[PDB]
Paper text:
Carboxylesterases are a family of enzymes that act on a variety of both exogenous (e.g. cocaine, heroin) and endogenous (e.g. acyl-CoA esters) substrates. They are defined by their ability to hydrolyze ester, amide, or thioester bonds to their corresponding alcohol, amine or thiol and free acid in a diverse range of chemically distinct compounds. Carboxylesterases comprise three distinct domains; a central domain containing the catalytic triad (S221, H467 and E354), a regulatory domain (RD) and an α/β domain. The active site occupies a 10-15Å deep hydrophobic pocket at the interface of the three domains with all three catalytic residues arranged such that a proton transfer chain can be established.
To provide a definitive insight into the importance of N-glycosylation on the structure and activity of human hCES1, the crystal structure of the enzyme with the mutation, N79Q, has been determined. The structure-function relationship of this aglycosylated hCES1 was explored alongside the wild type enzyme and a catalytically inactive mutant (S221A). Here, recombinant hCES1 enzymes were produced in HEK293 cells using either transient expression (hCES1 N79Q) or from stable cell lines (hCES1 and S221A). The yields of the aglycosylated hCES1 N79Q, glycosylated hCES1 and S221A enzymes were 39 mg/L, 64 mg/L and 68 mg/L respectively showing that N-glycosylation is not required for expression and secretion of the enzyme consistent with previous results. As expected, the mobility of the N79Q protein was not altered by PNGase treatment. Activity increased linearly with enzyme concentration and the specific activities for hCES1 and for hCES1 N79Q were 73 µmol min-1 μg-1, 98 µmol min-1 μg-1 respectively. Superposition of the monomeric structures showed no differences between the glycosylated and aglycosylated hCES1. A comparison of authentically glycosylated human hCES1 produced in HEK cells with an aglycosylated version of the enzyme shows that preventing glycosylation at N79 does not affect the synthesis, activity or structure of the enzyme.
Residue numbers in the entry: 22 to 552
The structure:
Amino acid sequence: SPPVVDTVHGKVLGKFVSLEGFAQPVAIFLGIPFAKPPLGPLRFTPPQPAEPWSFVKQATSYPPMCTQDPKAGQLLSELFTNRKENIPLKLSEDCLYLNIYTPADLTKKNRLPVMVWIHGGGLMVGAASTYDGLALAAHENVVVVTIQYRLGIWGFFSTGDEHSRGNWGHLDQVAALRWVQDNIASFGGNPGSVTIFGESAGGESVSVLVLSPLAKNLFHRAISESGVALTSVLVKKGDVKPLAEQIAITAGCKTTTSAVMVHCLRQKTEEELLETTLKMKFLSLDLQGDPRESQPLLGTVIDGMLLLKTPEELQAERNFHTVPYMVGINKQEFGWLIPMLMSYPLSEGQLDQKTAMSLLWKSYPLVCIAKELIPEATEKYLGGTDDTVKKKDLFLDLIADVMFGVPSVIVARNHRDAGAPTYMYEFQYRPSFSSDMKPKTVIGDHGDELFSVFGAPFLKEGASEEEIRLSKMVMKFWANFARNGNPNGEGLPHWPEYNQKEGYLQIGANTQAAQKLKDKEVAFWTNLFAK
């Protein structure tokens, strides 16, 4: 259009897009490779640097999304996209690409902050391309980078030993950050000011990166949105071997040894590993035999390269990256989106005590709560009322609190206590972009803040004046944090540091400061889990 940039491995050609209210068009570069494609023998291995190219690579097409269930993937991209229209993507193992939105005049001198987005989808689905960086980049003058990383089996297959350690997806995330360091100056970005941010499994990934020595000097601020390293559904402790064996059997491989399982899986076609994925029935709750065996996903493991010990132990040791860290959550993290996606046994308008307890047990993959604690937990949340419709609501508050609220505050506290500037928020607002099938009473569902962070009101239609102003404020807070490690700025509500007083920001129509986010839930669960 005609912007051409030279990266360490060769030239790329992007295009210009203008945003209303902004004279300088944003230069967009789609499908830049940050690694060699992880094919054949490179499956279940760390990413390798991309091979160099001659001439000018076209970076004007969205790349494929990493192999995943196309039905769940597209459904998630549709619900999370900040675009007027979702962009249908192709599936491939050839998926280690990133997309760049730089608002800089590349003919001129620039050294802008860089915000690197890591999408969610439970480490099983999701895509970079779902997220248009155009609005955030233009409104706040930051270079926005969206990254992809291997998912499901390809991303996280682990034998628990040196033949397939696992965490390939997080290695990709790290690879993308090294690429950013080595390249982003050519896109008008500052490699001394990188902010990583992510939502759900993306937030968990940011939290895990904060804890990993591999990610040292790769970023200078971090934001986890509705997900952290103590969101226990995404982090496998204990023996991963049974899972590995069930996958290899489902793939039609023998289990004689680890190295033999890995070699046999490496001979399978993309199509065969996808078939296997669909038969494992991940992102779904198994209603058979034991909840303690049911696997809704595989995910982060303690591999000895990325993570040396469990997040719990690493926090106590305080060896992690003490960068400024914003950790936040939404008011009803389990209000609609997540249960709808797993076809959760939620159906009736109400719910009694005894079902609650068996549901919670079958929910073990999500909440990771032993059977002896289940009566107490349910009584705690559901016992103060005989009203079965309010039982249902308290129950979703329960799951939300265990999955996100409590882990988040714990992470934030530990990060504060290590000596790092820490911020927290709780987001409470119901976007007009919400799916029509979500009840109007669900407010601050999982993902609801995305529309503000990415500026859906500037790209989709139908936004009120209130919704518009809400996005402008969220983006300015996010980018102020990227600039300064501190979201505050003149014109914005005061956001207190998450210090000994535990100030945090209630973000929504009426944005204001408060204190001790989830204090009583944290005490309750912690005391209960140490029984």
